[PDB]
Amino acid sequence: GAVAVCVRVRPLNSREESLAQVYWKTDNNVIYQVDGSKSFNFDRVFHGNETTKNVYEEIAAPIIDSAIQGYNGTIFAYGQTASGKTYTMMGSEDHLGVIPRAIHDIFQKIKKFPDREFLLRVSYMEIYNETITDLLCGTQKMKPLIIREDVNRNVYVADLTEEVVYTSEMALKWITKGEKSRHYGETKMNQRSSRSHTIFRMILESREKGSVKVSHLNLVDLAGSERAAQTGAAGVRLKEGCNINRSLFILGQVIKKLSDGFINYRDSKLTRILQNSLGGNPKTRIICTITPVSFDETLTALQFASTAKYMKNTPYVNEVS
Numbered sequence: 001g002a003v004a005v006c007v008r009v010r011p012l013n014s015r016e017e018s019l020a021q022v023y024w025k026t027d028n029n030v031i032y033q034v035d036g037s038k039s040f041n042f043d044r045v046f047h048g049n050e051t052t053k054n055v056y057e058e059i060a061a062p063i064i065d066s067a068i069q070g071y072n073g074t075i076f077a078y079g080q081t082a083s084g085k086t087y088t089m090m091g092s093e094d095h096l097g098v099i100p101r102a103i104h105d106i107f108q109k110i111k112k113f114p115d116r117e118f119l120l121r122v123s124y125m126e127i128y129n130e131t132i133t134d135l136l137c138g139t140q141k142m143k144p145l146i147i148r149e150d151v152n153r154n155v156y157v158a159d160l161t162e163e164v165v166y167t168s169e170m171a172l173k174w175i176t177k178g179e180k181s182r183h184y185g186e187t188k189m190n191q192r193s194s195r196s197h198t199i200f201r202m203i204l205e206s207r208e209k210g211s212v213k214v215s216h217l218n219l220v221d222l223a224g225s226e227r228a229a230q231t232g233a234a235g236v237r238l239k240e241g242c243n244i245n246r247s248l249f250i251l252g253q254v255i256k257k258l259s260d261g262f263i264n265y266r267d268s269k270l271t272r273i274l275q276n277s278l279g280g281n282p283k284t285r286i287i288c289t290i291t292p293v294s295f296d297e298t299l300t301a302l303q304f305a306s307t308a309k310y311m312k313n314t315p316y317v318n319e320v321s
């Protein structure tokens with residue numbers, strides 16, 4: 001249970017219906033090529049009519065449980081542009097994503113431990129064109145942030161704000177504030193493409209009401225692979241795509257090296273800041289989002305998700321003074 005990988009297949013979108021061959025079909029564990037021999041097995045495959053409540057309760061809720069018990073937990077959404085990462089991780093008021101569901105779930109679950117005092121604090125950062133910025137601190141205080149390595153060789157983002165929250169409502173208002181500064185852009189593939197990697201973090205601390213359990217819960221919505229022939233991107237949008245594709249290539253190389261056996265975490269800000277999530281001291285989950293009418297991008301995503309199944313994390317309960 002240190003590392004687990006699932007797939008989420010979305011329904012077809014407006015763009016795909018205006019066209020498309022279905023390359024992929026699924027059951028709850030296997031995604032297989034329609035008129036070919038390729039197949040991939042996962043601990044869970046979600047189909048197009050399964051909701052983000054199903055994804056949340058099966059994949060994320062146990063990671064929230066482990067965070068309350070003092071384990072670091074990280075959930076990544078990975079997949080091609082317009083495959084469903086932001087839909088799954090953030091969603092909307094109409095149908096909540098993993099991030100807002102985790103907030104409600106945390107505030108409800110900590111009431112089961114009245115003999116424990118909880119302190120919760122949130123951070124929200126973006127990695128855009130290999131620059132790290134604080135989405136919470138408001139525009140006038142935004143600046144490129146530095147990754148440092150502390151006395152225990154833990155990596156951290158220097159001067160990233162951490163906001164104490166006492167209600168679900170307060171946490172959700174911080175997410176809203178951060179979303180205002182997040183980089184989005186219009187392409188032919190997604191009218192609201194995520195042009196950066198985003199990391200929503202909760203630090204959960206608890207102690208007996210009478211030592212302190214500390215968990216970092218990192219909920220990560222990656223940018224997605226994209227091609228100029230599909231996006232019609234030019235100028236800054238096209239530059240963003242190049243940067244995104246480069247960063248995902250590096251994440252795949254780090255995952256491949258971990259699966260085999262030194263590890264090139266330093267080649268991207270994303271692999272450096274989440275090094276502890278990739279072979280380290282946390283429980284990591286990967287939600288691989290795919291569209292079934294893609295062959296090459298879906299194949300790349302399934303091969304990444306397959307390789308990540310073999311990543312060896314060694315999580316333990318984090319207890320300090």
Ligand SMILES: Nc1ncnc2c1ncn2[C@@H]1O[C@H](COP(=O)(O)OP(=O)(O)NP(=O)(O)O)[C@@H](O)[C@H]1O
Pocket residue numbers: 009010011013048079080081082083084085086087088190192193194195222223224225289
């Ligand atoms: N499971 C789903 N069910 C229904 N609609 C979905 C689903 N997944 C995605 N969508 C739709 O597809 C749109 C684009 O999905 P979105 O999550 O923004 O893509 P993405 O993977 O985040 N792409 P990008 O940020 O460009 O790399 C959403 O706004 C929804 O309309």
Ligand SMILES: [Mg+2]
Pocket residue numbers: 085086087192193194222
């Ligand atoms: Mg997105």
Ligand code: NA
Pocket residue numbers: 032033036037038039
């Ligand atoms: Na097959």
Ligand code: NA
Pocket residue numbers: 032033034035036037038
């Ligand atoms: Na087959």
Ligand code: NA
Pocket residue numbers: 127128129130195196197223243244247
């Ligand atoms: Na990027």
